[PDB]
Amino acid sequence: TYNLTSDIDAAAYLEELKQNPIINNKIMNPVGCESLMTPVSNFMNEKGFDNIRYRGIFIWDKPTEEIPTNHFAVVGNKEGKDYVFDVSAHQFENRGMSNLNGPLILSADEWVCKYRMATRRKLIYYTDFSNSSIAANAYDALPRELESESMAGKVFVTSPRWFNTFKK
Amino acid sequence: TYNLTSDIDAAAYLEELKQNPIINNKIMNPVGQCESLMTPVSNFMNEKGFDNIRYRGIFIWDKPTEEIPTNHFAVVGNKEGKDYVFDVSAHQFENRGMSNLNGPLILSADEWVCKYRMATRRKLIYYTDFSNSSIAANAYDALPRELESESMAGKVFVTSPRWFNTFKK
């Protein structure tokens, strides 16, 4: 399924982003993510996106999982519509989300669809923040109990059946 | 990308539909079947306890000057509060520009939207749901029609590509 929107010229944005070796390094070897928020954000700001936010994401495989998987994307508005630059989405390509096979630059709706349709069993939710280090703190990679998590401010991309069973 | 939801046991619904030889035939040969499929699928869903059954008429437009848009039909029903779309002839588009549509679909409403949205980069896709199947077939017929004179009232947009936003003047 497609990775780059034609709502904006994502193809050309991606070309430009790859000329930043901090970014390109990850686009080629997407493992290990936060450090992208800044250069991606800066890029977007130069291209005229505004209301730039940092999206912290958790991916939960099971209720009893000890540390959820985190992930980050940057969101920005261009002519009234939200877009998500998630240039390291494809670190999930070989982790059960093979539909995430390259960097994403998508409308907000397309991005949600991309993740939703990549998996049936994983619980995926996010929060958008004004500050990237607040995002990294709230969606950190430390042990966390799903039963003790506040769903306040969490936006669900999926809700697997186990998770509704789990909530009770 | 998955074709059957795990929100309900779409795998078992699919298999039961495929147990009916008339429906099996149309799923194996889906081109042009979606209209005739509405009633039998609807009857199945009704029997399986879905309510508020509607008939979804769909246009897919390639460009503004296209003489006749491509049409399609699916059936919507509610099961324990949530809408599910049975679209068992979606794979008619597989070898026609929408290769991500590679089998029959029984999905949540939102899943069904994502499937279509992400299957094309630049087709305009929109639909309307009707209580009556023959009204749906009429509304979304395959007769000559100009995009420019379509009312957008009551259309629900799966896509709204850049070119269409422009076309809107």
Author numbering:
A (entry chain B): 145 to 176, 178 to 313
B (entry chain A): 145 to 313
Give me lines lifted from the publication on this model:
SseI (also called SrfH) is an SPI-2-translocated protein that has been directly linked to systemic infection. The C-terminal domain (∼140–322) of SseI contains its catalytic function and shows some sequence similarity (19% identity over a 88-amino-acid stretch) to Pasteurella multocida toxin (PMT or ToxA), which causes atrophic rhinitis in swine. Based on its structural matches, SseI is a member of a particular subgroup (clan CA) of the cysteine protease superfamily.
Crystals of reductively methylated SeMet-derivative and native forms of SseI (37–322) were grown as described and their structures were solved using SAD and molecular replacement, respectively. The native structure was solved using the SeMet-derivative structure as a starting model and showed two molecules of the protein per asymmetric unit. No density was observed for the first 12 and the last nine residues of each molecule. The dimer is likely to be a crystal artifact since the C-terminal domain purifies as a monomer on size-exclusion chromatography. The SeMet protein was purified using 10 mM DTT instead of 2 mM DTT to prevent Se oxidation, which may explain why it did not crystallize as a disulfide-linked dimer under these reducing conditions. The chain backbone in the native structure did not show any large deviations from the SeMet-derivative structure, with r.m.s.d.s of 0.277 Å (chain A) and 0.250 Å (chain B) between the two models.
